[PDB]
Amino acid sequence: MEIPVIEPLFTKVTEDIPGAEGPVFDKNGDFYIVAPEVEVNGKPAGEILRIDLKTGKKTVICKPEVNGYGGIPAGCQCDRDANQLFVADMRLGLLVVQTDGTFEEIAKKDSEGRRMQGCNDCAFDYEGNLWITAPAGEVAPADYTRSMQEKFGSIYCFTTDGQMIQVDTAFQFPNGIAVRHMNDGRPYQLIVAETPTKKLWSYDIKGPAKIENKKVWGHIPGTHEGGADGMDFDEDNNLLVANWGSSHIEVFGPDGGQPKMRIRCPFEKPSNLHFKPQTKTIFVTEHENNAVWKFEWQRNGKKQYCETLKFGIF
């Protein structure tokens, strides 16, 4: 159109990853994907994989389980001060995963003593606070439920001082999440996808675990089943959003509203995305083929927290 559509070349990266999700680079430039929807005997047995970008070969580094309850690991962020992954898990809540495949479960309960909810995606701000979507109901051992039909999905902030703070509730499947920063580095806006309602929500970030000014920020095209899944900013603060079921990734300008551009994908179900540091390359997971691809965007990605320096000067 208007809405203008681009059709970049998609190159295959790897295949056969059930529910392929949470693409992420670590501080060494290794690449990881999660496979939330792997099952064994009809029960969750989701996986965290390292992908060799040269070969497409997959290695399962972690198949998390707590007390026999398998995980549904669905979204990732790399830490800054240690080379470890924070992983949102729909059964287990928030995990911290090492490169050696060992892991720890961070919260059974929130800061107010409520049972933790299962999580789907997360985003670090540059202050090191981790903003997390929680579209599942209570974590294992509670029977699994998810908010695709009913409004019981929540949002958390896991803070630098170790608090797991519930910051909003009553979403119908909160999904992707991203933080906008001022040019100086200050976090100031949180964006949250609400998948089936075809909305992106915004908040003003007033401080760690302090959000206000909830607003319907963006509108996701289409009336397909699905909607916005994963998201990330480019270096100009355009927000790229996988629109699962639509065959497109939407591109929002800084001010939201309607997409300014769409990216046609050669598949119906883009799920999540991530830039390779220092490049224009976006890795995309998708659920039509349960596979991972890459394509070239117009500019580099916005730096993730793990690309910033604790002891930087400028």
Give catalytic residue positions. 287
| Burial (0-12, 13-18, 19+ Cβ within 10 Å), 133 | buried
CB of 231 to Ca ion, least distance (A): 7
Among residues 26 and 121, whose Cβ is nearest to Ca ion?
121
**Residues 168-187 within binding reach of Ca ion (CB under 5 A):** 175
Q: Which of 89, 105, 232, 286 binds Ca ion (CB under 5 A)?
A: 232
Minimum distance from CB of 155 to Ca ion (Å)?
Answer: 14
**Cα–Cα nearest to 294, from 306, 304, 279, 309:** 279
Contacting residue, 37, 47, 110, 229, with Ca ion by CB under 5 A: 229
If one asks whether residue 294 binds Ca ion (CB under 5 A), the answer comes out as: no
Token reading at 49 = 């994989």
Angle (CA) 196 238 128, round 5°: 85
Q: What are phi and psi of 305, to 5 degrees?
A: -50, -40
Residue positions forming the annotated binding site for Ca(2+): 21, 120, 175, 229, 232, 273-274
By CB under 5 A, the count of residues binding Ca ion is: 6
Residue 274 binds Ca ion (CB under 5 A): yes
Minimum gap (Å) between residue 252 Cβ and Ca ion: 15
Q: By CB under 5 A, tell whether 63 contacts Ca ion.
A: no
- Which DSSP string corresponds to 76-118? EEE-SSSSEEEEEETTTEEEEEETTS-EEE--SB-TTSPBPBP
- Cα–Cα–Cα angle for 101, 41, 143, nearest 5°? 80
Note the residues at the interface with Ca ion (CB under 5 A): 120-121, 175, 229, 232, 274
